[PDB]
Structures are given as C-alpha cells and as structure tokens.
Design a protein around this ligand. Sequence first.
Ligand SMILES: [Zn+2]
Lengths: 122, 52, 50, 133, 50, 84, 97, 52, 88
Amino acid sequence: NGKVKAGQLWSKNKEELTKILGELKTELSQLRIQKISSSGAKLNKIHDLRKSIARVLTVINAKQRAQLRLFYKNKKYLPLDLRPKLTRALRRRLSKEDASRVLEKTKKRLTHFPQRKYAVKA
Amino acid sequence: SEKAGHQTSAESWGTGRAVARIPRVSGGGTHRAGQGAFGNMCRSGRMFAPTK
Amino acid sequence: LRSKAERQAKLAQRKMNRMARQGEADRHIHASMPKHLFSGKRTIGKTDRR
Amino acid sequence: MKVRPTVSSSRRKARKAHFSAPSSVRRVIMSAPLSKELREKYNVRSIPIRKGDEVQIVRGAHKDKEGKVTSVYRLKYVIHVERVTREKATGQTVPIGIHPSNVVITKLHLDKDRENILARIKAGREQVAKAKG
Amino acid sequence: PSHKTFRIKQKLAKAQKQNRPIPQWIRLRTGNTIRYNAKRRHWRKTRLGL
Amino acid sequence: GKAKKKGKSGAARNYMTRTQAVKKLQLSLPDFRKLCIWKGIYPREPRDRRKVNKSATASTTFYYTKDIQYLLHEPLLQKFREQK
Amino acid sequence: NNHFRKHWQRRVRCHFDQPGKKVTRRLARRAKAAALAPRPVDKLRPIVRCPTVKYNRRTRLGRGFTLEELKAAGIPRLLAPTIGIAVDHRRKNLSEE
Amino acid sequence: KAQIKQALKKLYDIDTVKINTLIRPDGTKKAFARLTPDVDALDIAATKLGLV
Amino acid sequence: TKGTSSFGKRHNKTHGLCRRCGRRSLHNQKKVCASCGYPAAKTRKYNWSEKAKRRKVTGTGRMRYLSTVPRRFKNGFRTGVPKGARGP
RNA sequence: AAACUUUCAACAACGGAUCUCUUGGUUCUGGCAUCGAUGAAGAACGCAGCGAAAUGCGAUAAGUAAUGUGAAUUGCAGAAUUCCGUGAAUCAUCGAAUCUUUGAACGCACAUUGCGCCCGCCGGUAUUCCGGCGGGCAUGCCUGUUCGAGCGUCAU
RNA sequence: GUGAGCCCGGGUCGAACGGCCUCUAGUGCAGAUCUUGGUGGUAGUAGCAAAUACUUCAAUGAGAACUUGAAGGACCGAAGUGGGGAAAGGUUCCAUGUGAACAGCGGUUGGACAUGGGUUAGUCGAUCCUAAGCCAUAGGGAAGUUCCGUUUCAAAGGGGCAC
RNA sequence: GAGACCGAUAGCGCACAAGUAGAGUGAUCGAAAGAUGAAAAGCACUUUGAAAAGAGGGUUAAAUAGCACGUGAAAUUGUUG
RNA sequence: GGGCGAGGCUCCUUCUGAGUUCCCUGGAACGGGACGCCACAGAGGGUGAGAGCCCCGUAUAGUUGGAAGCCAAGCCUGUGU
Ligand SMILES: [Zn+2]
C-alpha cells in the first residue's frame, strides 16, 4: 500500500487525482508522527507515499498543460512557459521565411538564369 | 606547461643571519608558507630550461 | 559488527593522537619559521623586540 | 588491429571505463559461457549471468563445484554460489566471491525476456553465418 | 551576542548541524576511504568567519 | 505589534463618496450615474460620515467600496471609451 | 641580425597540424566534388600575361573573362557564371592577340 | 502563528487559545499550542497524535 | 604598545557578509563588496589575477541550467514525446 | 674485570628512500558551435530510514514523468519479483515536468526573513474586523493605442 | 678492471627485467647561510619559583595533592576573585556516559570526547524617527568602468463639486 | 583520438570529501596527503590484565602482509657477540 | 510556373570467429610441455601470475527498428496576362 502506479493515474481526471493526492498527503502526515513515535518497516511506506505524491502531481501538471496546449493551439500569443524554449539567441534569430526573402530583381535573375547542370567533355 | 612552478606568490627574505636567499612563499597558516619557490633546485618549482 | 565499527573508529584516530591533536577539529598549522624571527637585521636605531 | 577512429586502445581509458562502468554495463561485463549442451540447444555461446542460474565452477580452488547463483554483487564484480562458502573465525558462513568468467552456466533461469535474448542472439548468429557463407 | 540577525542565526544553525563525527557505518562500506570528519569544527579552534 | 493609525480601517475603508468613486472609475458623472442605475449600485449611509470624509455634508452621497471595486470590471467601461 | 628583442615566445607558430590540414583540405575537396558532380570542381579561367618587365615573358591563368571576350564568343554575361565560366569586368583587352 | 493555528484546526480539529513560537538553534520552528479548556490535550495526544 | 596590547582592541568588523558572493567582504561602511564588487551590476574581475578569476569562473559552481544545454543541442532542441509514449 | 665511549656483525627499532604499480597530469591532433529577463554564471539554505563531506537533487528535493534494458541495491535495516512482467536498479537514455532564498535581479528596501500598493478567491459571528492563498507593481528604448498640453502654424 | 664500474655467492622479497649495435635526453653531486622530508649530540639538561594555603576522615575508582560530601584553616573585601549587561564568540549552557588525544604534574574531573535536551512576548529590544553622513531620480560631465548632482534650468499632484 | 612526455619531492597548486583544510579585516594567499590481501579469510576459543594490549591458538601461499598494513635504504637507537 | 519522385547519403538501434582438451609447477594457470582451432578479428582491458580461442570488446560486410533533413535519375502537368 502507498505505491501508486503511473498507469492507473493516466486514466483518471482532475477530481479523483486531487482526492488521491489528499489521501496520500494525509497518510504521510500521520506516518511522520508514527515514525517519530516508534520505529518499524513503515519508513518504506513513507518513502512510497512521497513518491506517489510526486507521481500524482506530475500527472495533474501534465494533463493541465496538455489541455492548455490544446486551448492555445490556434492563437497568436502563447504563455511564456508554453512557448518553446530553444535558446535566447535562437529565439531572436530571424525566421526561415524572413531569411529566405529575396528582392524581386534577384528573383527575376534567378528565374531566368539559375545555376545550370552541365558537364565538360574530356 | 609554461606556467609550471610560477603559479605562486613568493619573495626572498633578504640577506640575513639565518636562511638562504631563495624566494619564499608568503602568507601563513599552511605548510607552503615560508617554503622555497621558483628554483630548479626547489620542490614544487620550475625545472631548468623547460622543454618547448 | 558494532564492535568492528567501534574498533575502526578508534583506529582512525592513531595519526592525530600521535600528532597530539585535541580531537579531529584541531587542524591548526603553526608557523615553525616565522618571518619576524628569521629575517632582517638588528640595526643601531629602533629594534623589533626587546 | 583496430581500425575505427572511435575505438581507443588506451589502457588508461579502458581501465577507467571498466572500473567506473554503471550497473547496466556491468551486467554485460559479467557474462558467462553456456555449457556445451546449452550451446548446441540454443546456438548461443555466452549470456549475461543472473540470479537463479545454475553454474559449474571451472577455475580456481573451488573447481568442479556446482550450485545456483544466489547473488550478483555487481559492485564487487562477483557472483555468489550456494554452498561455495568459507568459514569465518566465529564459525559463521560467509560466501566466496567468484568471477563469472570462471564459471559455466549449466541451467538457465528462463523467462520471457531471457527467451527473447536467446532468440535474437541465435537469429543474429545465423544471419551473420548465412551472409558470410 | 544575544542580539543577532536571522541570517546569522541561520548560518549558526547550519554549522551546529554540520558539527558531528561521521556515522560509524560509513567505514564499513565497500572501498571506503573516509576515516573521520576532516572538516570538523570547534568553537575554540577555528572561527566561522561571519 | 505595530500600532495602527487612525482612519485606516472600518467605515473609512468601507465607504467611498461619489467624488472618490467617480475619480476611482475615471468616468464622467453622466456615465457613472448611468452605470450605477444599470448595475444596481445604491446610495448608502454610514453611522458617522465624518469617519469616512471630514468634508462630508448631509447631501454627500456614499457607496460601498466593494461595489465600486465590482464596477471596475464591467465591460461597458471599454464600450464608453470606444464610443468616445 | 637576429630580431628576438621583443617577447617573441608569445607569437611562435609551429606547424604540427600540416598533415592534418592536408587531410582536411582533401576531405573538403572530395565533398565539394561530390556536391558538384557532374560539373567540374573549378571554373574556366582565361590566359593573361603577367605584368612588369621581369614577368611579361610568361602567361598564366587570370581571374575571369572580359565582357568583350564573352560578347565575341557569343556567351551572355548572365549565362556565363552559371555554366562554369569566371567573369571579370575589370580587365580590358588592350590588344588583339 | 495564524498559519499554525489554521493548520492545527484543519488537520486535527484542534482549537487553541494561544500559540507561542520559537526558532530552535538547529533552525526548525517549535510551537507551543495551548488548547481550549473544554478539550483534553492528553486525550488528543493519546488518540489523534499517538503520543500516549 | 603597538603589538599585543593594541591587538586587544580588535572587536569591530570592517566587513560583513555579501549577499551576492557569500564572502565576508562587504565593507560595512562603504556598502561595497571587496571581492565581487556588489552592488555594481558587473562582477569584479581583473586580468592581473588568473587565480582569482579561476576561483569564481563558470564551472566552479553548480551549472544548474548550463550543464543541460549540450544534451539539448545534441538532440537538436527537439520538442514533443516519443511516438506511442504513455501519457496525456 | 665491569660500566662508559667508539669500531665491527646479527636481529629488532626509527624513518619512508628504492623497485614495481597508476581511474591522474602534460603536450599534440581531429570534430563541433550551444549561456541569459522563457531569469544565466555565481552565492546561500535545504532534501536520504540510518550522511558530516564529495556526488546528485529542489518542499514532486540522492528525485517525478517518458523511452530503453531486463533482475537488482548492498555498510546495516526493511521490503522485493506473480520470474513468463505497465517491471528491480545509486541502470542507461532523455523530447514531459518540478525547480526554495537569491543573483544582471525587477514594488520600495535589505547589516531588517522590514514596509507597501493593485486585483481576485477562501475561511473565521461579519456591509466595516481578523487571517490565509493566488496573480501583479523596476529602468532605458522601439512600434502601435488612447488620454492630453502649448496663439507653435492655420481653417472656420 | 689502473679506475669510473662490472659479475657471482648468501639472506630478504614478490612481477617484471637484462646483454649487444644504433637512436635519444629533464643523464652522473659533498658543498650553493642550497630545496623538501627525516634524525642526532646538547639532555633526562634548562626549566615547570608573580597572583599569601593548605589539612583530616569517608565515598567513588585499577589508580586520587589538584573528583565529591562532611570536618577544619584561609583569601577576594562591595573601584570584589560578587550579582548582571554592550561588543566579540556561537552551543562553550543542561543531563547522562567516556578508551586514547588535550588540560607543559596527575586525573575517576573538564569549556575535552560521545549521545541527547534546552532559548515561548501586543507591553523587553529590533522593527518607526531623524542626526553626522550615504545612495537613487532630473540634468550635466566622462572614450569608458562611471563622476557630480539630492532641489536642480523637471509638465515630479492633492482635494472638492457637478440634473 | 594519440605521444621516443611525467611516474606521487615528478607530472597541473590538486592522481585522495583540492582551489579543500588552513591563514589574512581585506584584496588575496594556499598545502600535506596514493599501494593489506586473489579473497576480510580483518584472528573463533582459552588465558593474563581496570584497560590499551600480551601470550597461546587460529586465517592465509605468506602476518618475515595485523586496517601503524607491498617492498622497507640511510641518518639515528636498543639488545646480543 | 507548379506537383510527384525511383534511388542515395547523414544519426541513433538488434546481431557477429575460434580450447576453459591432456600432463607438470603453483594458493590461483593467464606459466612450461603436448594436441588442435579462429583470424578482413594477434588493438585494448578484465579474469586469483605473460590469455587471439573464459568475458567484454576488436575486423568486415552487412542485417533488424525508428526519426528528421539533404541531394537526386526521371515523370506528370499551365502557358505568356
Ligand atoms: Zn560579494
């Protein structure tokens, strides 16, 4: 008891995950008093309760972020934590379209005189 | 390495009545303090004519 | 195992007990050749000590 | 002679890698040969050893002793075999560490993953032999 | 002194919790080279430097 | 703990005069009166009006500070500014 | 006549990377040839005569063909650098030969 | 002190008349919570806390 | 009496602890750290002390974020999850 | 004659040379381009059943998720693993997360865990009181929005 | 063997090493008040002599001048060898236990060593005020790190009323 | 990835919980320190001591390897001749 | 002017030859002797002493599975505002 697997958590929604988090936190709070009052094999249980709380928090955060990404899928401005990280310099880099933009005179020259494929007889 | 034996702050204690005039590591509170430095004859010092 | 551990803890103190340290916290390195005692000359004017 | 530029013949780097290998690498490092019967049954020469395998000791002062693997001390690069023990001073029993390259596996502790390992080793050996033949 | 700031008292708390000999089970670990606390502090020997 | 100062809690925080409310919402008086009618903000009467405002008279109008705070979020304010 | 009166030891360049740099250049040339195939790896260059009285006996390759050379050969100046011909608008043809 | 009394009420249904706090020399906080006279602290320590 | 007797009067503090670098180098009257130069925006460093530079240089601490950048570069700063991975 | 001093030898001391070893330096060569307000480098304080440090991590704290592997970890204690498996491990990889107080450090300050302001939510008898929680409030500059000022130039 | 040296026997020991011809060098020590480390004679020597001073019984303990209780004798002598604080220290405080090391003699004792415990505020301080003084802002200097500036050559904001 | 490099007083200051311990108000200064054994098999049990330990008896191929630990030079010391 | 595109390349992944045969010394063969085998692998390391064949690896063609790009033989089509 106290070991909650991620597989069962990935199918729950927010309310039962919150309820499970509440019960796990209550058991850990009682078990700390049990630790300071007596010694036993319940230290394994407190370790599993800590890791189960971590798993539940991870799953709740992941589902909330997935829902938010779905909500912000078709919007121009995203929250800064939902924006891709990359590096600061990569984010300041010119976009691919803007870097590939050429002048129209250049475009006419490239349309009518591109680099050709050729060979020279020996 | 070109910096070997020269990463120390050390000065000679001068002509006197007690010790040889090799430069000695300044400071205190450690075994290195007051010990000889920079010489090819010194422990933890620069070798004669370092290889290039 | 407790007896073995206590013996190892006592055997860990032999070098510092030979060096006569007051416990493991005593790591003071004293000046065996102080500069004020091993440099300079006593002139005819002011002296560094009486 | 090694040819590939990613291969190093440095003794220092080899010993550093060997004695600082993590646990999954140490599992591959403590491999043991199979017995002749198991080799002809599975077309497999060697496998990483594990707890529950039955081995025969073929080197050292405990040669020809047989038993089950009771522990794989990967931290000490050693395995423990049941009844291959010695007596302490106090009259208690302490296991004797045996390197897995000094034993031969006579019975495999079989599960689905071990069968997958044996099957893919056999398939690779047959494919290589067919390609080179 | 009795008058002290919170930051100073926090640093003194950390020093008090650090002031201990090593657990005896450390010496029984495989390949252990730690024999004692080489950074052990005492109030008479070495100053905290605050 | 630290000694409180006079006039920083109680009715002085509970009530606002109409002048304070209009300046707080940054509205003109016709827009404010229109919005109070439409949102049901009603005049109120403190027990001691001097504790709210020392220049208050019998004709001074008071409102709840929380009601004015609620009016801060009404979408009609941006409609007013857009029409202007 | 030894010029070692400055701190010369800070600016000594040895050349232990000479075979490595040859290998790097050969790898770059092979990559360039593979990218350019079946075109030649280089551009066609004209024949020019070296300046000064010491070297005007000898001819060598120049930078690129002149505009009047391209016009007399019937190659338009926009087509020429796309078919492996180097073009030099600065050089002029002072003589017929 | 307000956070401590709210947490005690939320966790153990404990009502306190006053709370005194100190920070121990090790760096942790210690709280003396005096309970209301109608409630028995020995009973709470026996059942809810298991301190016998 | 410029030695031992004078040394008994040493009970003040020229420097306290600096909030930026943690050393006992914050001059209590000038409010300037002698080591890191706080509260100036730049951290104090000089080319006449290679040792002092190497005591505080990048890599001598924790590299809480910078140590993970080479792995993300090696995988190309990719985003997302492996195909078919369990999750939301 | 002994003792003492000195010399020679054997054994025993003292001390750590010599020899052998080397998960370390040093030098050369080849490849690569990737820090930070989306809060870096650095600092502080914490986190393990039993750790002070080193190492790892951040109140999800010697770690969580995911992928892979496929039976450990180990100094002790305690549990394992349905072994024909949503699965051990101080395992590897690593694309999802968490990431205390700080620091260019950003409400104002900081030798103070000092003092604020704005907007929400919750609880305690509560339209006023008390408490808790969440989101915000630095500077320079650019584009734009909106509210303005001046007989500065005009129209009417 | 003239020699620098080379070779062998015996003892110890435990994992590598040598001859010959060439190649190569960080290649040969008694000195440098040489460097680092280690060790002598001096020598069981100089000394352990300021602050008036100790004694008896019992207990504890392997062991008691310097542990404890009692019994005596003294000293500080209220500008104290007393009772409390500021700076500074940081757990030295309290209880229990203790081999070595330390307490220039001893030690059962200890500020030592080991494991634990201990610091409770609306009223005491900090927190607030300003002093001498220091630092932002406007603005002006300076290649610049930055310097001056603190009321200025600043559009630097408060209140009230309104059908 | 390598070397006609160095082999723990060398080689980076650092082969080790090293930019650590320690010193300085501060800027800064800045060490020493690697090797039991193949495997802890790290000495059961008896005996003498208050204890540390000693002696028997053991482990080991070897304790002439006893967590002062490979080898174990010299200065210098003890005993025996 | 557009759209396909066989095929190729780059990166991680599954897999690869042959003695633990007999005698002697030894605490332990990885030493000595004999008889074999592999080798596009006799680099390096580990294993109780110098191991190609005990173990990891090492050589060479390939061979499983996946992702993102690039190059590219050719092939469909609009036609001149
Ligand atoms: Zn600082």
